[PDB]
Structure formats: structure tokens, C-alpha cells
Amino acid sequence: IEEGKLVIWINGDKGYNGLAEVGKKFEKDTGIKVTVEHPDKLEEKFPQVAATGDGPDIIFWAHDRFGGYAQSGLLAEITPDKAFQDKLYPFTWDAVRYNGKLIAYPIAVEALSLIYNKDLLPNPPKTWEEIPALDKELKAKGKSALMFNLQEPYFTWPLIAADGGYAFKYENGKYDIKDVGVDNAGAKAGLTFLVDLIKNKHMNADTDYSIAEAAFNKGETAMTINGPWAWSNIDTSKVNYGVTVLPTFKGQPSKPFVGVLSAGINAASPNKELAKEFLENYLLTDEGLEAVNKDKPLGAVALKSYEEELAKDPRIAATMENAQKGEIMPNIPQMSAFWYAVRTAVINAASGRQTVDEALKDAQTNAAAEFNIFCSNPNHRTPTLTSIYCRGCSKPLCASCVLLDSSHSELKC
């Protein structure tokens, strides 16, 4: 890692040209070059390069994969003064909390929404159940009802969760990673519905992101599911669209995993003060967030001043409606073994290589297999096994401590 400059990694579906502008504004003042890159599979190649002291100074991803980075000692703990912490929403600070330590700067809150073409669909559907009847009607016009990304489980999980599928059992502000809910009734129900759109030719089994994006933005399909980042390409196309709550399924609402975009500082960086000065005083400002958001939209930003300006956007409001009905994503290291397990099950059940009951069984057992962890109470003079984490601080706590010792509550920590 070069001393005296900054190298930033951020996923290619964000506004990295905007961050580049914030880099050139940092460079004008300080003379410090700021190089912004968007590598493919950067969420996976960062713990590779960081393990030997390589990689970027700053890493950008949704918060869920940061606990694994921190567990492997790849992220510097970040130390904003209470004055700066007050500038960002408390909701977003909890998402970047791990083992009680802040390990990333929260940037923005993402949530999947149902996006619809107002000209084809005056009143978008409130339920999943009526989409097949809707597509059948639109098929008489040579158009489709719904196309979205079936290759990444993020996009399909809201429906899988609607009737009661979950990743880890959440209780009084605690996760239990031995209570995995991938092959329960609610998830089997939700997944069986999705594939029954493909069987009845309402969706194609191999729709990826680019295909669904091109098809909605070209006016071929009336609906798609996506996050705020996608609005930039919908806006520059000539589609007249709106953003609304994901439709219910079996009367229960669709529950997307809520993502907090976060900026982590490499533990092996010689530029931790420059990275902190860049993020705190250039990115997390009205001017800085406005340059990134104006490239590809960020969603509801973590900074109270700028969010107070974006809150009047109906698309932000819709994202917040879906964010409320969903749940914040865990950040514990097991989350990525879970994302792999669920990715394989969905693509196999949608393609027909497996049945839904076959695919969810394999994923449930595959997942739980990776999931040895010890309670974080120091008064245990011997490592005490547990599978419970506290949600707020992402801290392990043994079953004994969870019941008798009222240190960690859902309301307050």
C-alpha cells in the first residue's frame, strides 16, 4: 500500500464517478491523490489481499460482510468524536457496530422496492398472488409483468421471508445462529411461489440484473424489483416510473434485508488519518454525498443534514416503507456462508435442477455446517461456548448470560 495517497474500492453499481469527484476535491485541498477503483468480486478479494497487508485504504460495501472482515482483523477501528457521531443517524451506527467497536463509517440505507411503469400499470399490485393473473393480461399485449434478478438471492429473499423464512432466529434483540430458518414452511412457501411463476411462464428462469434492467428500462416489462442505485439508469431512460412497497404474500408484507452501505479502513493502511479526514470531512458532508448521489442514487444517507433534503423524494419514502417492513441485515461472520447457501438453492430451484424442498434442505444444512464461538463476558475464566449474538453490538453471549444478566436489551445496550 502506497504511503501518501488513498486507494478506494467500491462496487460497480454505485456512483464511483461521484466518489472520484470527492477524491479530486480532497486532492485540490490536501494535494493527496485519491484513486477510486471498482473491482469485480471485491467483497471476496478484499479479505484475500488484506490478509497480507495489501488492498485499498478504504473499502465500500453493505455492512453485512464487515463483521467477517473485523473477525479476521482486516479493519481499523474508527474513532469519531461524539460531535461527529451526532451528525449521523443512530440507526446507521448500530449497523457498523461489531464486537462493540465501530468498524466502518455508515453511508446510506438501502432497501429493495417494487418499481413499476405508470403507463402500463396505473395501479401496481398489492399482492404477489395477483401477478400471475396480471402477467396473463399483459401477455395479451405482448408485455410482461415482472422481471428481476434471480441470480442474486438478495432480490428474492423479501418473498422468501414474507411468510416466515429467516436467516437466524431473532428474539429480544438477539440472534441465535443454531436456529436457521431456510427450509421452514414460510420459506418453502415463498420459494415455491416464485418458481411457479417460471413454470407458468410468468418469469424466465435465467433473468439476471442486466437483463431485467434492460427490459424494464426498454419498456418491455411493467415491474421490476431493485434498490436506489438502479434509479440512475431508469431516470436517464424515457420510462415513466414510480417506486412503491413490495407486494404482500399470503397477507404478510415482503421483508427485504436492509443494507447500510459502509466505508471500512484497512487495518494495514499507512494512511488511516487521511482516510478518516477524507470520510469525515469530505464524503460525509452535504456537498460530498450530493456528488455521489447525483451519479447513482445512495438511498437514505446516514448524514442527518443531507437526508433532511432527500426525505421529500417519494422514492426515498418508498424505500423507507420497505426498509421498515424488512429487517436490518446481521453482520456476523456467518452471514456470507448463508448468502452462498441461499444463492445456490434459488438458482437451482428456479432452473429446475432441484425441487424447492430439495434445494432448501441442501442450503439449510450447508449453511449450519460452517456456523466455534465463545461468550464475550471476560469474567468467564474459561471460553464459554454459545451461538447467540446481540444484535446491537454484534457480540456473542452465552445462554446463561442471555437469561440472567440484563446487560444487553433490545431497547438499549
Ligand X SMILES: OC[C@H]1O[C@H](O[C@H]2[C@H](O)[C@@H](O)[C@@H](O)O[C@@H]2CO)[C@H](O)[C@@H](O)[C@@H]1O
Using CB under 6 A, list all residues that contact ligand X.
Answer: 11, 13, 43, 62, 64-65, 110, 152-154, 227, 259, 339
Least distance in angstroms from the C-beta of 258 to ligand X: 9
The verdict on whether residue 390 carries a ligand-binding annotation is: no
Whether 106 and 96 have beta carbons less than 8 Å apart is answered as yes
Least distance in angstroms from the C-beta of 384 to Zn ion: 5
Q: How many of the other CB atoms lie within 10 Å of CB of 210? A: 9
Least distance in angstroms from the C-beta of 92 to Zn ion: 17
How far apart, in whole angstroms, are the C-alpha atoms of residue 173 and residue 188? 26
The verdict on whether residue 38 carries a ligand-binding annotation is: no
Given Zn ion, ligand X, none, residue 18, with its beta carbon under 5 to 8 Å by kind, binds none
- Our finding on whether 223 is near Zn ion (CB under 5 A) is no
Q: Could you give the string, one character per residue 109-148, with x where binding to Zn ion holds by CB under 5 A and - elsewhere? A: ----------------------------------------
Given Zn ion, ligand X, none, residue 55, with its beta carbon under 5 to 8 Å by kind, binds none
The verdict on whether residue 63 carries a ligand-binding annotation is: no
Cα first-last separation, the chain? 37
Least distance in angstroms from the C-beta of 154 to ligand X: 3
The site for Zn ion, by CB under 5 A, has a size of 9
The verdict on whether residue 401 carries a ligand-binding annotation is: yes
> Could you give the angle at which helices 185-199 and 131-139 cross, rounded to 10 degrees?
10
Please choose, from the candidates 113, 395, 94, 96, the residue with its C-alpha nearest in 3D space to the C-alpha of residue 242.
Answer: 113
Least distance in angstroms from the C-beta of 71 to Zn ion: 17
How far apart, in whole angstroms, are the C-alpha atoms of residue 299 and residue 277? 23
- Our finding on whether 401 is near Zn ion (CB under 5 A) is yes
β-pairing, 166-170 vs 174-181, is: antiparallel
- 386-390 long-range contacts (CB < 8 A, ≥24 apart) are 387/176, 387/177, 387/178, 388/174, 388/175, 388/176, 388/177, 389/174, 389/175, 389/177, 389/330, 389/332, 390/173, 390/174, 390/175
Q: Could you give the string, one character per residue 350-379, with x where binding to Zn ion holds by CB under 5 A and - elsewhere? A: -------------------------x-x--
Mapped onto helix, strand or coil, the DSSP state of residue 249 is strand
- Our finding on whether 97 is near Zn ion (CB under 5 A) is no
Please say which residue, 46 or 89, places its beta carbon nearer to ligand X: 46
Please say which residue, 259 or 326, places its beta carbon nearer to ligand X: 259
Show binding-site residues for Zn(2+). 375, 380, 401, 408
- Which residues contact Zn ion by CB under 5 A? 375, 377, 390, 392-393, 398, 401, 408, 413
